[PDB]
Amino acid sequence: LAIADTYKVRVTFGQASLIVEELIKHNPQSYQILFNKFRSAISFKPTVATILSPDLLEKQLEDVTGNSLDAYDIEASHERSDVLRDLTEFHLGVTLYNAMLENNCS
Amino acid sequence: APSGPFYRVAGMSYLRYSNICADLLRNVLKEPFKAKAQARQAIHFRQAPYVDGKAGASKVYELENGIPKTAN
Amino acid sequence: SVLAASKMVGAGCATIALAGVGAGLGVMFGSLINGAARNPNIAKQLVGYALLGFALTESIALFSLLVVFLILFA
Amino acid sequence: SVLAASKMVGAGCATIALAGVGAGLGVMFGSLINGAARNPNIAKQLVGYALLGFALTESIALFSLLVVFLILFA
Amino acid sequence: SVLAASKMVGAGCATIALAGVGAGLGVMFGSLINGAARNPNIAKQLVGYALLGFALTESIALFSLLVVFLILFA
Amino acid sequence: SVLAASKMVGAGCATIALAGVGAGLGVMFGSLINGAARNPNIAKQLVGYALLGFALTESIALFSLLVVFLILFA
Amino acid sequence: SVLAASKMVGAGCATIALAGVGAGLGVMFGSLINGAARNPNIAKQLVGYALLGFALTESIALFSLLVVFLILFA
Amino acid sequence: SVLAASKMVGAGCATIALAGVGAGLGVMFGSLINGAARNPNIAKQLVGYALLGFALTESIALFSLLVVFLILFA
Amino acid sequence: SVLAASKMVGAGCATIALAGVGAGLGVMFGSLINGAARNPNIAKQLVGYALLGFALTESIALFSLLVVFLILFA
Amino acid sequence: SVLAASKMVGAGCATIALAGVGAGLGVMFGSLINGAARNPNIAKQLVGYALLGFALTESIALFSLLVVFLILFA
Amino acid sequence: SVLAASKMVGAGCATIALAGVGAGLGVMFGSLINGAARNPNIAKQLVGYALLGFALTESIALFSLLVVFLILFA
Amino acid sequence: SVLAASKMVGAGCATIALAGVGAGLGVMFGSLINGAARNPNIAKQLVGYALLGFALTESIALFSLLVVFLILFA
């Protein structure tokens, strides 16, 4: 996949949401984002950002003698799997939006 | 086929549902603020899947009112 | 006679089991509505479980009507 | 006169079964209201589910009224 | 006079089904309040279900009052 | 005075139906408090459904006061 | 005095109707605690709703107590 | 001595009203623990709601106890 | 004969255990419907969990009908 | 011995309120587990609230046993 | 033989205590279904809790049956 | 011998408290399953809370067995 002309007018969250949805057209177990983090005008640290897919890997990485997610009382309409699906999609959209803002400013 | 909330059983991702709600909130703002909120609504990019490493068909986006409410 | 009078008052006091059976059917058929609202696409499997559990809890409405018939007609 | 009198107090204790039928009916109709507020697009299917459950738990009310009208008039 | 006393006892023992009817009405209207607090746009569409469930749970109240009037005056 | 004695134990066994309407409107007013904590913007709207359910559930309390005020005097 | 003998049993079975108001007030004042835990900023409005529900649920308790006193002292 | 024997069973039926205040008290004191697990910062306000509720349902318990002592000793 | 009369009226009120068995059965199968609506991938395990629960809550029904067998026919 | 017989019927009817007290205590000690599962960091404060509610709930079990021992030995 | 008569109606009223044990078993296995649908990985430990809870409500069922055995055959 | 005959019906009417005890134990042990399904990390603590609640509700069951033994054998 090749996304281009992202920076023509400006970067919005809906744009990164559509890019994240085209990343949702594939169903991976992780997402890796490579971008340059705008620390200063001279230093731009390259950053790898990882988004774990919800019931495929996200619960599995937190299963540490029990779980690390059991402390949270899920106040959603449906189960923890769907709130993790929505949270992983929202985390991917936010990471992607921030990645292409950091990379554009650097 | 699917199971869950009303967007997940309609074939809609959570990002599209939340962006639809955010666009509908941006539409009902005051005119000092809705004109500024017109800026964060425009989607302008283009994607092209690369099945071979050299070519692929293209789909562009020139949207101004927000995310498409209809399914794509 | 008191032998039939006790039969009639015992069969009257014997159908009180149907109160709790009907309460069970009501909460179960309400959970059918709530479960069909939760997962709407698997609604027919939930009506399948509804009729299965209906036939499995009516068996003691029929196990109390059996005792009513054994009181009155045995 | 105790045989003609005991059937009255038999049918008195026999329609106590309509308490739990009414309780289950209110629980099931309240779950109809709740499930239609959760998911209003499935409302006319949930009303049909509520009427299915209403008939199948009125079956217990008819089984209790059977013994009521049996002792009142066997 | 034993029948004239047992007919008076049996109606009072019979009308305890109105307890479960009132419990069902209370549960159904409490869930009506919860459903109108969840999805307030269909509040008038949920009162239409609550009145339906009220009139269909009053069927059990009328079927218990039927037995009360059949013990008392028949 | 077997009629006059029995017509008070029948009234006492009739009064028990107010228990279910008390336990019904208890959960109805509890869900009124719950729904007003759910969203206080329509908390003045939910008081209307609460009063409607209270009057409609005290219809059953008046149906039990009908029989307890009928078999004590008529 | 068998009239005044059944008078005590009539009052004693008539004050079983307080069980439902004691359970309903428990559900109401438990839902007040849950509603104050969810939205603590409108807690003092929910105490108003809980005392309104308590005064309208006390109606059933005093309606039972008046017919207890009419069995006993009338 | 049928009045003096009858008021024993009348007082025995008269304290089934404490089952309801026991169940409602347990529901309300379980809601205290749930609400204090949710919002522990206002736990000493939720205890002030629990004791208000405990007063207003043990008032129903003492209504029942007043009728018990009125049956046994008056 | 009052012995057979008491064997009839005792086994009459002995089968009210099936009320609570029916309420528990309805609650359990309602939670089967609900839990299958939550996690529908494991419903083949959840029904096997319900039938263990069914056979383990019908042991109470067996223990009540054994007493009705020991009162009517022993 | 009509009096000493009814002092043992009336003591048996009096201790049916321990059913409601035990059901309330089970609801409260289940809510302690449901509240201590959400945040176990304040589980000792929740145990303190459970033992406050347990003493205040078993007060009414002591009331019912008081009416029992007031019927038997007074 | 009124002593051999009343031993039947005593045990018949005594086996009403299995109703609440059946309702508790039904609530517990319904919660077993819901807990297995929530967390399916720990579902074999939850069965070890459900069998413990079944064995400890069976204790109340065996105490009711012990009272029945002690007043039928002694 | 109306005394020793009345002891049987009094003890049988007395031991219906074990219904509410068994229902409380069932709610408590179901909440143990639903609390160990939330976080199984503290299930070895929640089972201690469940056994504590079991003992403090077997206090109620033990009072009911002691009043049954005091009806029968004193």
UniProtKB/TrEMBL annotation, chain A:
Localization annotation: Mitochondrion inner membrane
Family per record: Belongs to the ATPase gamma chain family.
Name this protein carries in UniProt: F-ATPase gamma subunit
Residues of the full protein shown: 160 to 265 of 317
Automatic annotation (TrEMBL), chains C, D, E, F, G, H, I, J, K, L:
Keywords, alphabetical: CF(0), Hydrogen ion transport, Ion transport, Lipid-binding, Membrane, Transmembrane, Transmembrane helix, Transport
GO MF, one annotated term: lipid binding
Keyword Flavoprotein: no
Topology with respect to the bilayer: Multi-pass membrane protein
GO cellular component: mitochondrion; proton-transporting ATP synthase complex; proton-transporting two-sector ATPase complex, proton-transporting domain
Domain V-ATPase proteolipid subunit C-like span(s) in chain numbering: 9-71
UniProt-annotated location(s): Membrane; Mitochondrion
Gene Ontology BP terms: proton motive force-driven ATP synthesis
Ranges that cross the membrane: 8-34, 46-73
Main location: membrane
Family: Belongs to the ATPase C chain family.
Protein name: Mitochondrial ATP synthase subunit c
Residues of the full protein shown: 54 to 127 of 127
